[PDB]
Design a protein around this ligand. Structure first.
Ligand SMILES: Nc1ncnc2c1ncn2[C@@H]1O[C@H](COP(=O)(O)OP(=O)(O)OP(=O)(O)O)[C@@H](O)[C@H]1O
Ligand SMILES: Nc1ncnc2c1ncn2[C@@H]1O[C@H](COP(=O)(O)OP(=O)(O)O)[C@@H](O)[C@H]1O
Ligand SMILES: [Mg+2]
Ligand SMILES: [Mg+2]
Lengths: 47, 469, 508, 188
């Protein structure tokens, strides 16, 4: 019996949900930052 | 010839003939029924008895009821007059519109095409679905599978394909509902009537329907696939033209075969399947082929009992298909629809010499990045995104953008999502994924790519998100 | 208790003395027919596994000889057979035609042409159920069977007279391994060396006809049919034909083995022959075992695979390599048939999907792959480079977990990771592009001496490409020296050093 | 195969198959009465304690059993049909259920000559006049040429009335069922 990549999130136990949330929070933050930068670029390039 | 029922056990009827026996697979008609009950011979038991599976309810049968021998297998009406109609396994209409008035009746049992008839030419069939076109492109005349458990999108995906390919397809089209919900059959009938492929007034119908839903006894579910296949075969040969053939699901054929095997005296095999699973499935899937006389594009929905792709039924079905699109529940939970698994889907034409080196390289880059993402997800479960190498975070970001960009809104899933259906031409999908990999979008947020057609729509959605930030 | 011949028809016949006008020695009357199994009354002089012939033009194999009746398995649809039919002995166990008249012909399990190219020549016939050789005719495996694949030829060598096993999951590259092996033998068959020519047999059990047609087109494109036989037992074929097709192929190959030539037979796929036999056994009411397989299924596969031998010079010296293909499910090599055939064969080429999608196509997973013949089936030059390559890869596989980290580790593990990545990028191969042994040894020699430790991994797959063309055009004398000589002489080693440095000294 | 003529009443089982074979063999050539008489004869012949003890021992070889039965059949001058039937039962080892065959054929022959077994059950016996009118009315129930085979059991468990079976037809004018019906009517 072996192990394969991407198995922690295939089980869906506690580590799977923990990893999913650790990913989602980080990328929500980065999406917020990128959206702010996109708005700033929009305004600065209107002219 | 005239025989006489001598036993009735469930759906299996034993009929005794005093004259000469009827050959295996012949259709027999029970005399004394208000409706039409047709038995099909399955075995000769000796002592002039023949075992048979009833194509209808065996309620009210009496030991001794006389039976007529039609002398030929079940013969269904075939021709351009079946278009726009609905049929049983035994070919009688169930659309309450009058008799089907054809000149040709075709037996539902026939030998598969011989090896000296196979076409060896493949050319991509563009369906307008990003994931399908990119990673598991279909092919004209090839057999397509749509594996996946329950509630993942098999029916929605096949309806979307009928909406796209069938609507703008010159040739004819056949739909065989095998052991599926009757609600869905009625919904499809009405959706086609609205679209116009089924025209109840003129003779311009482009779709022929055959139904044997899950209220039918196993005998009828095990043969409605053969009835639809016979209609498609006729349109392939005599009409000499392209055909589409949608089947939903082709696991109910196997399952219905398994519900009577134990009563026919066969020892069960594997996980309680009939010993003849592979042979029974092969003698059917081998008539759905693109010979040199015609061309059937066959799309099949294949239930996977409990998401288990190693079950004998889907496992055996895998070998009969050119392209497969393994819909996955783990991806449907995430909201990515259609939930096609990009790593568990394959196609035969997916080679650099059939699609092109740009398409092939884009597809392989996407698959590699997704596999690397899967490898990283194990680490992120212990460290956290904050502790990844500044290059690995780039892989994760690209992988999530690509994961979202494969989602697409269908024109038939308006009711669920509420969005609007998009058809994405192949060049636009290749460009979108090549750009997403090349890094030309590593500043737009992930959610901009979720449920949009071409990439420019993702840019516009990101612009809207930023403005209303 | 009860018997199947106690039906009232037989008793009626026997009561009024009507059983003397019927020849119950060479003819029989079908008692039952169903699901492809007929139960026949009579045929008292019929041998086990003999072929009988039904009145309606069909054939069948008489497998179960019971006191009352004979259990015949029909070679086709039982639509044409009815209770009461007449079944006549043929007199002879099932056999198939053999010879060079089959090369380039697609045949079915019984030697009938199905490609519509005309009748099959056929001067000699051979029984499909013939005992394999013994302890004595054979001699140790020594000659190599050039697969043309860098991984298989470098780390999983296959000799001649060996039974490898291409075990893997679904859609991983097993048939691709087989077809590349078949196509690579053109460089030997075209040539004149009569002891390097390999004739190929491709047994296609349970595949749909479209797949086999595309495969035959692929072989014809590569001009690799003039020395290939293809034996088709596709899905629509009756279970007995799928059961027999491996044996027909093995006998068509045993002909070549006996007559001094060399053959390679690719039973693709054996896990479907097992299913066909399982169906036949369950319908003959034989006692099932694990997973419903009959008891004698290990016997079924062993008596087939033990006919792949390397006869000794006192018998001709010919050989018959076997490359059975088995499709495991999830990854369960501990299932029943995978277990049997892993315990029968001499190695295993173990393919993955993780590796397939990580970009390592062919997905040969080294570490789980093995070849209990090993270096004995390699050339001297390939031995020289592959020993170091295998050692370095083994070192790399036990520190591959750190790959994501990598940095913030000692220099030794940095070097191990770097060399391992370069080597894995070297073992990558295209499709239907086998490589001569000289090309493989040149590439691996460049790889394993550090001459790629400067190139970035993404560029290796390009280097390997361009570099190869260079040597295949500018330097033919060195390649010919390595090929014919078989080893890397010190002068040839120096020439390879200079060539690799000169090409690498200006690449970019 | 030879299109055997089916018997009137279908008997099932091993005895049923052997008896149906015998009936089909006899019906063609026409020897049903003689073969039935011979069957009744062998009913006693094999029943002899010596023969029964020598035929219920499975350690005397089938060869010896067949030889002894051939000697007995020759010593009794039977039709070839009955001799072959006994030989066939001996070869297959079906002697332990030979009477079940003779019984079966009897059931199969009685219906051939037209007979519908009947049963009458009453609390107490009957006076012959009433039995005569029962005969008359029951013969009214039957068809043409169908002789009747009356049986008059006496069941005191019922409290009166009558119970009549004609083949599968059944009429129950017994006081017990009326008591049951009325009582159940009360409780509802
Ligand atoms: N080395 C390779 N490089 C690129 N593509 C490959 C390679 N090996 C295999 N493929 C591709 O992978 C796909 C599946 O390969 P293949 O059909 O040979 O595997 P398989 O296990 O035989 O499939 P199945 O067992 O389901 O028939 C093919 O379309 C083939 O072109
Ligand atoms: N393209 C889609 N977009 C959004 N939701 C979908 C889509 N396809 C399927 N679904 C979801 O799946 C359900 C229908 O699944 P369906 O495909 O009918 O089941 P199955 O595939 O098991 O036959 C719907 O209720 C819907 O919520
Ligand atoms: Mg559905
Ligand atoms: Mg394959």
């Amino acid at each position: 019996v072996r192990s394969s990549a991407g198995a922690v999130r295939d089980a869906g136990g506690a580590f799977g949900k923990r990893e999913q949330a650790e990913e989602e929070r980080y990328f929500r933050a980065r999406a917020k930052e990128q959206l702010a930068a996109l708005k700033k670029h929009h305004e600065n390039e209107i002219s | 010839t005239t025989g006489r029922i001598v036993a009735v056990i469930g759906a299996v009827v034993d009929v005794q003939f005093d004259e000469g026996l009827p050959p295996i697979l012949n259709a027999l008609e029970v005399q004394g029924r208000e409706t039409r009950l047709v038995l099909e011979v399955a075995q000769h038991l000796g002592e002039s008895t023949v075992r048979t599976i009833a194509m209808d309810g065996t309620e009210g049968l009496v030991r001794g009821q006389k039976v007529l021998d039609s002398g030929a297998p079940i013969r269904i009406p075939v021709g351009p007059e079946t278009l726009g109609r609905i049929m049983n396994v035994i070919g009688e209409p169930i659309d309450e519109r009058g008799p089907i008035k054809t000149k040709q009746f075709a037996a539902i049992h026939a030998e598969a095409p011989e090896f000296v008839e196979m076409s060896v030419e493949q050319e991509i069939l563009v369906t307008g679905i990003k994931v399908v076109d990119l990673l598991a492109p279909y092919a004209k005349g090839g057999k397509i599978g749509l594996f996946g458990g329950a509630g993942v999108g098999k029916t929605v995906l096949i309806m979307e394909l009928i909406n796209n390919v069938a609507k703008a397809h010159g040739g004819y089209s056949v739909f065989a509902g095998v052991g599926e919900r009757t609600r869905e059959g009625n919904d499809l009938y009405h959706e086609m009537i609205e679209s116009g492929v089924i025209n109840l007034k003129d003779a311009t119908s482009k779709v022929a329907l055959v139904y044997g839903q899950m209220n039918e006894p196993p005998g009828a579910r095990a043969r409605v696939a053969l009835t639809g296949l016979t209609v498609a075969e006729y349109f392939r040969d005599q009409e000499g033209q392209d055909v589409l053939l949608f089947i939903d699901n082709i696991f109910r054929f196997t399952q219905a075969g398994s519900e009577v095997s134990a009563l026919l005296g066969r020892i069960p095999s594997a996980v309680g399947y009939q010993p003849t699973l592979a042979t029974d499935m092969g003698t059917m899937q081998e008539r759905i082929t693109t010979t040199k006389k015609g061309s059937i594009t066959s799309v099949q929905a294949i239930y996977v009992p409990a998401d288990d792709l190693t079950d004998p039924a889907p496992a055996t079905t895998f070998a009969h298909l050119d392209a497969t699109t393994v819909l996955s529940r783990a991806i449907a939970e995430l909201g990515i629809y259609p939930a096609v698994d990009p790593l568990d889907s394959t196609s035969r034409i997916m080679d650099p010499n059939i699609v092109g080196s740009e398409h092939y390289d884009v597809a392989r880059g996407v698959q590699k990045i997704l596999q690397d993402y899967k490898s990283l997800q194990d680490i992120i479960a212990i460290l956290g995104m904050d502790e990844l190498s500044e290059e690995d975070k780039l892989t994760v970001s690209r992988a999530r953008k690509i994961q979202r960009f494969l989602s697409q809104p269908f024109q038939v899933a308006e009711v669920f999502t509420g969005h609007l259906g998009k058809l994405v031409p192949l060049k636009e999908t290749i460009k979108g994924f090549q750009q997403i990999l090349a890094g030309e979008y590593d500043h737009l947020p992930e959610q901009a790519f979720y449920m949009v057609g071409p990439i420019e729509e993702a840019v516009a959605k990101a612009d809207k998100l930023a403005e209303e930030h | 208790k009860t018997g199947t011949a106690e039906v009232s028809s037989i008793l009626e016949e026997r009561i009024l003395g009507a059983d003397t006008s019927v020849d119950l020695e060479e003819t029989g009357r079908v008692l039952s027919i169903g699901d492809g199994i007929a139960r026949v009354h009579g045929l008292r002089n019929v041998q086990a596994e003999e072929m009988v012939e039904f009145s309606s033009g069909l054939k069948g194999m008489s497998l179960n000889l019971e006191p009352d009746n004979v259990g015949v398995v029909v070679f086709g649809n039982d639509k044409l057979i009815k209770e009461g039919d007449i079944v006549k002995r043929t007199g002879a166990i099932v056999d198939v035609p053999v010879g060079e008249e089959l090369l380039g012909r697609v045949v079915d399990a019984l030697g009938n042409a199905i490609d519509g190219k005309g009748p099959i020549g056929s001067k000699a016939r051979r029984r499909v159920g013939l005992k394999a050789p013994g302890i004595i005719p054979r001699i140790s495996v020594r000659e190599p069977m050039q697969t043309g694949i860098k991984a298989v030829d470098s780390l999983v060598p296959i000799g001649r007279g060996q039974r490898e096993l291409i075990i893997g999951d679904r859609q991983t590259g097993k048939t691709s391994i087989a077809i590349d092996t078949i196509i690579n033998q053109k460089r030997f068959n075209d040539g004149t060396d009569e002891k390097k020519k390999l004739y190929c047999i491709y047994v296609a059990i349970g595949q749909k006809r479209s797949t086999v047609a595309q495969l035959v087109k692929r072989l014809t494109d590569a001009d690799a049919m003039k020395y290939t036989i293809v034996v088709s037992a596709t899905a629509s074929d009756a279970a007995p034909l799928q059961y027999l097709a491996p044996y027909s192929g093995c006998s068509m190959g045993e002909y070549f083995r006996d007559n001094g030539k060399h053959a390679l037979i690719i039973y693709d796929d054996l896990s479907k022959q097992a299913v066909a036999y399982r169906q036949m056994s369950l319908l003959l009411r034989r006692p099932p075992g694990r997973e419903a397989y009959p008891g004698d299924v290990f016997y079924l596969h062993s008596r087939l695979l033990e006919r792949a031998a390397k006869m000794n010079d006192a018998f001709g010296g010919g050989s018959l390599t076997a490359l059975p293909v088995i499709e495991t499910q999830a990854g369960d090599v501990s299932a029943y048939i995978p277990t049997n055939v892993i315990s029968i064969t001499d190695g295993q080429i173990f393919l993955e999907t993780e590796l397939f999608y990580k970009g390592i196509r062919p997905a040969i997973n080294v570490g789980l792959s093995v070849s209990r013949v090993g270096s004995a089936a390699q050339t001297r030059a390939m031995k020289q480079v592959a020993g170091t390559m295998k050692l370095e890869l083994a070192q790399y596989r036990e520190v591959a977990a750190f790959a994501q980290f990598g940095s913030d580790l000692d220099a030794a593990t940095q070097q191990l990771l770097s060399r391992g990545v370069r080597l894995t990028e070297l073992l990558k191969q295209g499709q239907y592009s086998p490589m001569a042994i000289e090309e493989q040894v040149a590439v691996i020699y460049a790889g394993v001496r550090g001459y790629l430790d400067k190139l970035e991994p993404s560029k290796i797959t390009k280097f390997e490409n361009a570099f190869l063309s260079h040597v295949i055009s500018q330097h033919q004398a060195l390649l010919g020296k390595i090929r014919t000589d078989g080893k890397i002489s010190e002068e040839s080693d120096a020439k390879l050093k200079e060539i690799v440095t000169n090409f690498l000294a200006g690449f970019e | 195969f030879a299109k055997l003529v089916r018997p009137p009443v279908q008997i099932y089982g091993i005895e049923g198959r052997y008896a149906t074979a015998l009936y089909s063999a006899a019906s063609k050539q026409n020897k049903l009465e003689q073969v039935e008489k011979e069957l009744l004869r062998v009913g006693q012949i094999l029943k002899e304690p010596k023969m029964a003890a020598s035929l219920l021992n499975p350690y005397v070889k089938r060869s010896v059993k067949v030889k002894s039965l051939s000697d007995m059949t020759a010593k009794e001058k039977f039709s070839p049909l009955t001799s072959n039937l006994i030989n066939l039962l001996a070869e297959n080892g079906r002697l332990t259920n030979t009477p079940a065959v003779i019984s079966a054929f009897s059931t199969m022959m009685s219906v051939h000559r037209g007979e519908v077994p009947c049963t009458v059950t009453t609390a107490s016996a009957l006076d012959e006049a009433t039995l005569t009118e029962l005969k008359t009315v029951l013969k009214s129930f039957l068809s043409k040429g169908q002789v009747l085979k009356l049986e008059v059991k006496i069941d005191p468990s019922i409290m009166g009335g009558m119970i009549v079976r004609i083949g599968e037809k059944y009429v129950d004018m017994s006081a017990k069922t009326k008591i049951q019906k009325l009582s159940r009517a009360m409780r509802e």
